[PDB]
Amino acid sequence: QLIPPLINLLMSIEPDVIYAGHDNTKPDTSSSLLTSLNQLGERQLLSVVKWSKSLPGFRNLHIDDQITLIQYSWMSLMVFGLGWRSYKHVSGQMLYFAPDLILNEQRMKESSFYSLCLTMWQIPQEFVKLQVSQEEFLCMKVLLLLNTIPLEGLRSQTQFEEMRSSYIRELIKAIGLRQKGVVSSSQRFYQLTKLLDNLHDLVKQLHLYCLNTFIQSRMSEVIAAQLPKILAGMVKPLLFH
Amino acid sequence: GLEAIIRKALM
Ligand SMILES: CC(=O)O[C@]1(C(C)=O)CC[C@H]2[C@@H]3CCC4=CC(=O)CCC4=C3[C@@H](c3ccc(N(C)C)cc3)C[C@@]21C
């Protein structure tokens, strides 16, 4: 019938359209395309922060926990959002970074980062195969913000665990909206959470690309800074399987 | 300088 209140609340705090400030009425160069993406990334970061403060439970956490979670989640959140837009607007056939920045297959190949494109393109394809709902996407997204904590843990550890548990229950409610039956629901939950778990690996790849693209545009200080985001055993991932 | 930006944005 109706949509659960929390999920409806999630829909209403979804960030509105963010343009890249890209001119499509003129051919792109390797310089302008990368410049457009960085500008979009900066704008999307401020949006992630603004979105997190409207998230029930997030403000209860110590300011230091809030910072940490965003540091360990911005990449995942950005590529997951890209996955959703590409899925909804163009059936996952191309990368919908923004309304004024859509990369089709032929353009991805001509670029100097087709490999990265194929990696990111994995998500929209998965959304198509699973036929993910908006309600499911919204709950999964919050779970990404709460999927990695430091080895020592957080200051508001108990408050965090409770928040994580609430959104897990919400995802189950989202699934229940269409999956009627305990066997089908259980099977759906496994598929969606398996997808969430796989993002831990995929995101390390994106961080490496970012680190390698930096090196190419320009020493041990730079390496050491990003290492914790590409290497295993540095942080504590929260896996469902 | 992301940590700084994230912190200022949160406040
Ligand atoms: C081709 C390439 O190498 O891109 C990257 C690079 C230049 O190394 C590698 C992965 C990229 C990354 C993937 C996810 C993403 C999704 C979007 O809907 C807009 C920006 C966006 C970016 C870009 C982005 C993201 C965030 C930020 N900031 C400032 C937080 C800046 C740029 C540029 C990144 C990092």
Quick structural gist:
The complex is a heterodimer of chains A (241) and B (11). By secondary structure, chain A is mainly alpha-helical.
State the end-to-end CA separation of chain A. 32 Å
Characterize the overall form of chain B.
Answer: elongated
The small molecules bound here are: ligand 2S0
N-to-C SSE string of chain B, H for helix and E for strand: H
Q: How many helices of chain A?
A: 11
Structural class of chain B: mainly alpha
User: How is the CATH topology of chain A named?
Assistant: Retinoid X Receptor
Q: State which percent range the strand residues of chain A make up.
A: under 5%
Number of strands of chain B: 0
Notes on the protein architecture:
- Chain A: It is found in: Nucleus; Cytoplasm.
- Chain A: Belongs to the nuclear hormone receptor family. NR3 subfamily.
- Chain A: This is Progesterone receptor.
- Chain A: Progesterone binds at residue 85.
- Chain A: Residues 6-241 are annotated as: AF2.
- The complex is a heterodimer of chains A (241) and B (11).
- Chain A is mainly α and 241 residues long.
- Chain A has a single domain (1-241), classed as Retinoid X Receptor.
- Chain A is built from eleven helices and four strands.
- In chain A, β1 (95-98) and β2 (101-103) form a beta hairpin.
- In chain A, α4 crosses α7 (122-130) and α8 runs antiparallel to α9 (157-176).
- The longest helix of chain A is centred in the last third of the chain and has 36 residues, at 182-217.
- Chain A is globular.
- The two termini of chain A are 32 Å apart.
- Chain B has 11 residues and is an all-alpha fold.
- Chain B is 82% helix and 0% strand.
- Chain B contains one helix and no strands.
- Classes of the chains: A mainly alpha (241), B mainly alpha (11).
- The interface between A and B is small, with 11 and 7 residues.
- The ligand CC(=O)O[C@]1(C(C)=O)CC[C@H]2[C@@H]3CCC4=CC(=O)CCC4=C3[C@@H](c3ccc(N(C)C)cc3)C[C@@]21C binds at residues 34, 37-38, 40-42, 44-45, 78-79, 82, 97, 113, 116, 206, 209-210, 213 of chain A.
